[PDB]
């Protein structure tokens with residue numbers, strides 16, 4: 001292994017002590033293989049059912065539930081073969097919930113897709129190498145490839161490992177690094193070394209990366225690194241090293257069951273001391289075996305009451321339609337839990353070109369020299385029409401229609417655009433729209449020359465298909481192009497060498513046509529061309545040139561500027577070496593500046609308003625772009641990220657600046673910054689780390705495999721629809737339209753869904769709380785069971801679930817996007833609210849136990865010990881003459897349980913309404929605001945009746961229908977809830993804070 005880009009061909013071959021002619025000997029293989037291991041990415045995490053299903057049963061809330069099942073199961077063996085056939089139903093029900101959720105968990109994981117695994121798709125199975133064994137090439141498993149090995153690659157092949165290119169057999173070698181950056185555009189490679197040791201991947205021109213495809217050509221290369229050491233391998237290591245916190249909610253629930261454990265144990269403690277007087281009891285032992293079962297059956301009934309069994313379902317269901325809901329809005333959410341974190345986002349960093357802008361290019365303005373006389377200097381500024389790539393536009397000076405042929409500056413400028421251009425234009429018949437063939441920026445040049453054909457070749461009659469390339473073709477005829485000097489970032493410009501084709505025009509010999517970044521290329525220009533004539537460059541002219549460039553790049557226009565020039569007297573073709581990019585800058589010198597072209601990558605119509613939403617929403621939006629700081633800042637002010645006159649000095653940074661900054665100042669810039677220009681690959685991961693240092697819930701956009709480590713780091717990684725498969729798998733959500741606004745829209749739902757979800761959760765928790773109290777009162781007083789576990793399940797699973805699900809449909813607040821992002825820390829229930837559900841819970845507690853008691857006594861249908869100690873009901877059979885002048889089996893009766901159950905159900909439908917809003921009275925906030933809630937409420941009651949009246953059910957449940965009169969008692973007991981809450985709902989939004 002090594003940093004082969006900086007090394008020479010000979011150095012690399014020397015390092016490994018390998019011959020380019022023969023390759024590695026079999027011995028060197030043995031040693032190399034042992035030392036460097038195999039050229040493969042590590043294995044998938046070993047998971048098994050037996051390991052999967054146990055994680056299902058390792059949450060506390062599932063363990064105590066499991067434990068409860070056994071007890072009931074055991075208790076149910078003690079049940080007389082006659083006393084109940086259905087004894088075994090109670091334990092089963094618990095288990096089949098635990099089995100059902102267990103089932104749910106596993107299916108989700110089987111489907112879940114790892115991001116690391118997506119990298120493997122880039123691993124080729126085969127590769128071709130040269131070794132000592134054979135003169136002829138051998139095709140082997142990429143896995144068996146070792147560093148220092150001689151490798152052969154050709155078109156179509158997927159690069160097996162990171163390779164230093166030794167020699168290129170083909171005339172030209174092109175590679176497709178789209179897997180990396182997302183760009184389909186091929187790139188030329190060279191043998192000559194890269195001087196910089198820290199050069200970023202993009203600048204390693206003498207390098208081949210594992211996973212990439214060869215666009216064109218054939219080459220021979222030495223293997224620098226393999227397996228984990230490759231660029232892709234390093235990226236895997238970053239992703240493997242990265243760890244993801246649990247959704248804030250998730251974190252809350254874990255502490256919930258955590259605390260719930262303590263509370264549960266505490267209840268038993270208290271329950272035990274309340275009945276401590278039992279030590280001052282007869283030692284006859286009579287009924288001792290009996291007391292245990294009762295306490296045990298109380299324990300299980302307690303567990304189910306404490307836990308909200310139905311909750312898991314209710315939540316996932318709500319998230320599922322919310323997900324489908326977002327899908328309609330072009331927002332694809334993978335993994336439901338992320339919906340919450342999606343509402344909490346405080347910072348969102350979005351790539352410019354892909355999302356924030358259309359990536360649809362067109363030339364708006366352009367200028368050429370008009371007159372250079374002494375200090376006096378004048379230029380010709382033009383304006384072009386048409387945002388589409390479609391050659392349907394007009395050139396106008398001072399808004400007045402112009403025939404381009406009139407100016408000789410334009411004729412030369414136009415030839416440059418067409419000749420120094422790789423991309424073309426194609427017309428598609430199916431969609432009926434003009435489409436770019438190659439690069440967006442280049443395509444708009446081919447587009448321009450059409451609108452301004454300086455030869456005015458007639459094409460109005462030409463078919464639309466033939467129209468697309470007409471005016472370009474004519475220019476391609478004029479000059480034969482010998483070769484081209486591709487773009488390199490050092491000089492930031494590209495050139496072409498052209499022999500004048502044909503005898504009629506065969507004059508002035510060969511010429512060079514260069515285009516690139518204004519600053520760079522203008523320094524090389526020693527002359528300026530006015531019309532046909534040419535004049536030596538002077539300060540004053542150069543200034544007037546650069547001035548308009550700044551105005552166009554930094555001004556309201558925010559145009560990307562290209563400087564077009566020609567080398568009138570290029571060097572002799574023979575003196576030129578075309579295999580080294582380093583010599584390119586010296587070829588492009590002594591140039592004659594013809595004119596510049598300004599083009600725009602227009603922001604999306606939806607963006608401006610979407611940015612404002614973030615201001616209103618408290619969300620900080622950070623832009624990532626490729627433009628130079630100057631214009632980048634300009635674009636920010638154009639979409640509202642910055643005020644036109646707002647100071648930005650400390651809020652805008654480039655990769656260079658950021659790197660120069662010390663760690664402290666770096667972290668500091670992150671909280672301030674809203675614009676990063678010319679960013680390096682590592683930064684995205686860094687920025688996220690920093691934003692997370694301030695506990696910011698951050699969103700990141702990525703398209704390629706390099707962005708992956710970042711998307712997996714950021715709280716919410718966002719990938720494009722056009723994005724690579726790997727980018728998608730690492731992200732939390734994918735933008736189908738790639739539109740930025742789609743991001744903002746998702747956050748709105750993220751907040752909206754969470755609010756309703758918050759309500760139905762408290763609603764379910766509250767019912768639990770109340771159920772625990774009843775059970776506890778039942779235990780402390782020694783009362784007979786008001787509620788049986790089986791019943792509770794039904795209530796928590798179904799009766800509570802439906803209104804809870806309906807609550808998920810609550811109409812959204814109007815100020816959702818006017819409030820700052822929710823604090824992940826903030827608890828669901830605290831302070832006053834906690835006290836509320838504390839009180840309410842108590843009410844339902846007393847209500848249920850009391851309703852069952854009111855039947856045992858003071859009831860016509862039931863024989864009552866009015867205000868007597870029915871409590872000692874354990875001792876009836878043995879102690880019946882004393883106080884028990886009646887049958888003792890009466891305590892088994894269902895009527896009291898149904899009475900107690902019924903009141904619960906009714907109270908719960910009420911409490912559901914009180915949950916329509918946290919602090920808003922129902923007259924202020926009717927129940928009819930949400931139709932579904934009322935609709936679901938009716939449903940739950942119907943079902944409640946069902947279990948009472950249909951033959952098989954009431955028996956199983958231990959319920960019997962109650963007289964109309966008995967029903968009324970329920971109402972007198974349950975309905976008062978709304979009043980209670982309304983009052984606690986009248987203290988807050990008035991006398992408390994708020």
Ligand SMILES: C/C=C(\C)C(=O)O[C@H]1C(C)=C2[C@H]([C@@H]1OC(=O)CCCCCCC)[C@@](C)(OC(C)=O)C[C@H](O)[C@@]1(O)[C@H]2OC(=O)[C@@]1(C)O
Nearest residue numbers: 255256259260263267270306768769772827829834837838
């Ligand atoms: C039945 C449910 C049981 C036990 C149970 O939920 O127990 C407590 C508990 C985990 C919480 C408390 C409960 O306190 C009691 O109900 C005290 C009961 C005393 C009983 C007396 C027996 C002697 C909640 C529910 O209570 C109320 C309404 O505010 C509020 C809120 O959700 C939580 O504070 C929650 O823990 C958290 O992390 C929060 C932020 O979600």
Ligand SMILES: [K+]
Nearest residue numbers: 244712714715
């Ligand atoms: K994550």
Ligand SMILES: [Mg+2]
Nearest residue numbers: 181704706707
């Ligand atoms: Mg990128």
